Amino acid sequence: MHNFTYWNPTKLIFGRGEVERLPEELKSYGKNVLLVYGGGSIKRSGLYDQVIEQLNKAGVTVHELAGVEPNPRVSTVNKGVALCKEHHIDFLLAVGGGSVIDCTKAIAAGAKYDGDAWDIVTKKHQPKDALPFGTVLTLAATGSEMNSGSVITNWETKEKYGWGSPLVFPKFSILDPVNTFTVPKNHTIYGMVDMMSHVFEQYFHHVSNTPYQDRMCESLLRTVIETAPKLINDLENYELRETILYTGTIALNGMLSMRGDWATHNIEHAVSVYDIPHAGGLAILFPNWMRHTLSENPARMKQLAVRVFGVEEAGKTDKEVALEGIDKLSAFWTSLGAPNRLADYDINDEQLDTIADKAMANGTFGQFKSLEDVLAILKAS
Amino acid sequence: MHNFTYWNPTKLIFGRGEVERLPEELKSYGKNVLLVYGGGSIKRSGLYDQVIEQLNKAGVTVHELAGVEPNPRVSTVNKGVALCKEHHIDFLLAVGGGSVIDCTKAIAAGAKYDGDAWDIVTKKHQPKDALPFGTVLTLAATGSEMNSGSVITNWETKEKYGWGSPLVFPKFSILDPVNTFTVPKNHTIYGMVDMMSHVFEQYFHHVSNTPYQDRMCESLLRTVIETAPKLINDLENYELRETILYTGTIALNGMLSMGARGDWATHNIEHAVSAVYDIPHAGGLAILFPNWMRHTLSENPARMKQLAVRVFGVEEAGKTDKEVALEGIDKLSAFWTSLGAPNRLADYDINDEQLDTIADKAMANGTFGQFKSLNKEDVLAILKASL
Ligand code: NI
Ligand code: NI
C-alpha cells in the first residue's frame, strides 16, 4: 500500500571529457563562484587544474573552500557560508565525492540564511532559498550528485544528522568515469558497498506489489556484484569504472524509491563519535540487521538470496535460504577487503550504550522493523 | 557507451485518489486554467466532475477545450491558442491520454508564439517560451505524461510530425491507476504491446557495456509478461492496473535509453503502414516486430539470444545463438497472439498490393534504423514476410 511523488530536476551530464561542459552550463548564472573540494585528491589527480582552466574559460571570479572532511563538519559549512557573503558568491561548484557535495548543499542553503548552518542541518530552519550549485563527481556512492539530501557532522556535539530540501538539488552534475580513476582500492570498495547498501535500504519494506522495483533493485545488485571483483584489480579500466559510476548515480536515484527502511544507516551514523568510514560501518552492521529483522518477513531476504546471491533452496526453510544469502553477502564484501566486525576499526563495547542512545535520540526508527534493538544489533557486530 | 545528458523535471504524483492533489499543486500558478480533454470518456467515468470539483476548491476560473482528436490537429491547437489569448490563460490542465497531452503541449508553446502553431510542429519556429501545464492521465503507456514531445496532424496536408522542446515538460502529472479502469480490453492490450515494443526499440543497439540498462529492459519485459494475461481478464484490478501504469511511464520516459540510442525502425515501418491502412498502432507492431527481429538477426544474434534466454526462458543447451534467438522470437510472437494481438497483415485484410507505396513512405527520409540501417529492399522484405 503506497502512494508516491517523484521529482528530480538535476541535469545529468555523462561522458568522457565532459568537464568541458562547465562554460556552457555556467552561462545562466553569476560570475562569482565558490569552488568547494576535499583533501589533496583533486590537486593530486589534475582535476583541480582542469576545472580551474574551465572556470577561467567562463570568465568566472573563483574563490575556493578546500579541506572538506570525509565526514563533513558544520564549522567548515559555516566557513563556506561566510565566504559566499564576503565575495558575493552567485554559484557553488563541488568537485569531489559525496562528502564535498553534502557540504556544498549546506553552504548553498546557508548562504541565504542569516544565522548558522547547524540550524538547517537540525531541521530547525527549513530553507526558503539557496544559492544554485553544480558538481563534478569523483566517486559514486550514495547518489548525492542527484538527490536533495545531505549528512553533516557537528564535531563539538558529536552529532551527525541527515537533512534535505527541494532547493538543494544540484543544477547539473558532470560525471566522467575518468574522474574516478584515481580513487584507491579501499575507497572504490567503500563506494560499491555504499551503493549496494542503498539498494538494500530501498528493498526491505512491506509494500505489496512492487514487482518491477524489486527486479530493478536485484538487477543493480547483480551488476555491482559482477563488476566489483574485476574492477578492484583493474582500477583504470574505463568500462568497469563507467558501469559503477552509472549504477551509483542515475540507476540508484531513479525510480528505485518510486519507502525505504534506513535503520542500518541510522545506526552507522550514531557509531560514526568514532568518525569511521561510513560504508565500512555499513558492511559490518547490515548483515546483522538483516539477521535481526529476518523474521519480520523472511521472504524479502529469501528473494535476494535466490535472485541475487545464487542460493539453492532445495531442502531448506525460507529462513535457512535467507540466512545463507546473508552469509554470502558478508563473504562477498569481505572478499573485497571490507570489514565485518566492530573490532576491525578497534571499537569495543565501551560506548555501545552511548551510541544506541544517540541512535534513539529522535525516537524509534525503521520501516521494515521499528527499532534495545539497536543495542542488540551493535552487540552482534 | 554514448555520451548523454539526462534532464526530466516533471513531478510525478502516483496513487489512488491523487487527483485531490490538484489544489495544492495549483497554488504556484495563475488562476485562469484551460481544461483540455478529448471525447466523452472522462465525463462518462466521473473523472471530469472530480476535476471540476477540485478546480473549484482551487478558486480557479475554468475554460474548456473539449474534443481533442485521437490524432490532434494543428487546427485544434490553433483553437486552443486563441482561447488562451482571449481568456488570458495562465495554466493548462490536460485530462486524458497522450493525444490530449500532445495537443496541450502544442497549445502551451503556441500561446507564446505570434504565428501559427504549425510552424512549431514542423520545426520552422523553435519555441522560446511556453505556458505551464499539468496532466491527469487516463491511459497507461502513452509516454506523454513524462516527456517533452508531441505529435500533431495537419488534416489539410495529411502530415503528422513529431516536435518537442525543453519548455513543454509537464509541471506535474497525476497518475491514479483507478483512472485507467475503464480502458477497454483491446486498448489495454494495445498499451502493453506498445510498451513492450518501446523497450525492444531501446534494447536493439550495438553499444557495448550497457549491462544495467539491459537488465532494466529485460526486467520491464518480464514484469509485463507476468501482468498482461491477468490484467486482460481482470480489467478493474487495482494492482494489475497499477503495475502497467507504473512500468508504462518508465518504458517511455527515457530512463531506459540513457547511454544508448534506440533503433525505432519497426515504429517507422508501422507508421508507413498506418499512413495507408487504418489499423491500431500496436497491432501493426505485433505483426511487424517479430519479422524485423528475424530480418536483422545476423547483425548480432547474441542480442536477441539474450532476450530469448533472460526474458523468454529459452534453454540454450546444444543450440546455436541463431536458433536460441529464433526460438525467442517465436515465444514472443506466441505470447502476443495469446493476448489477442494479430500476427499477419492478413488479419487486418491487408494484402501485398500497397507494399511498394508503404516502403517508399518508410524511405521518405533515407535509410533508417540503428541496429541495422534499412533501405527499401529491407522494408519490402519485412513487409512481405509479414503478410
Ligand atoms: Ni550511505
Ligand atoms: Ni509505439
Author numbering:
A (entry chain B): 1 to 258, 261 to 274, 276 to 374, 377 to 386
B (entry chain A): 1 to 387
Any passages from the paper?
Based on structural and biochemical studies, we report here that YugJ from B. subtilis is an atypical NADPH-dependent group III AAOR that reduces furan aldehyde in the presence of a Ni2+ cofactor. YugJ folds into a two-domain structure consisting of a Rossmann-like domain and an α-helical domain. YugJ interacts with NADP and Ni2+ using the interdomain cleft of YugJ. YugJ was highly active as an HMF reductase when supplemented with NADPH, but it was inactive with NADH, indicating that YugJ is an NADPH-dependent aldehyde reductase.
To obtain structural insights into YugJ-mediated aldehyde reduction, we determined the crystal structure of YugJ in complex with Ni2+ ions (YugJNi) at a 2.15 Å resolution in space group P212121 by molecular replacement. The asymmetric unit of the YugJ crystal contains two YugJ polypeptide chains (chains A and B), which are arranged into a homodimer. In the YugJNi structure, a strong electron density peak that belongs to a metal ion was found in each YugJ monomer, although a metal ion was not used for crystallization. In the spectrum, a prominent peak was observed at 7.46 keV, which corresponds to the X-ray emission energy of the Ni2+ ion, indicating that the metal ion observed in the YugJ structure is a Ni2+ ion. The Ni2+ ion is located between the two α-helix bundles of the CTD in the interdomain cleft and coordinated by conserved aspartate (Asp194) and histidine (His198, His267, and His281) residues. Given that YugJ exhibited high aldehyde reductase activity in the presence of Ni2+ ions and was observed with Ni2+ ions in the crystal structure of YugJNi, we conclude that YugJ is an atypical group III AAOR that favors a Ni2+ ion as a metallic cofactor. YugJ exhibits interdomain flexibility in the absence of NADP, given that YugJ chains A and B in the YugJNi structure adopt open and closed conformations, respectively, which differ in interdomain angle by ~10°. In contrast, the α9–α10 loop of the YugJNi and YugJNADP-Ni structures adopts an open conformation that increases the accessibly of the active site. Accordingly, an additional three-pointed density was not observed in the YugJNi or YugJNADP-Ni structure obtained in the absence of nitrate.
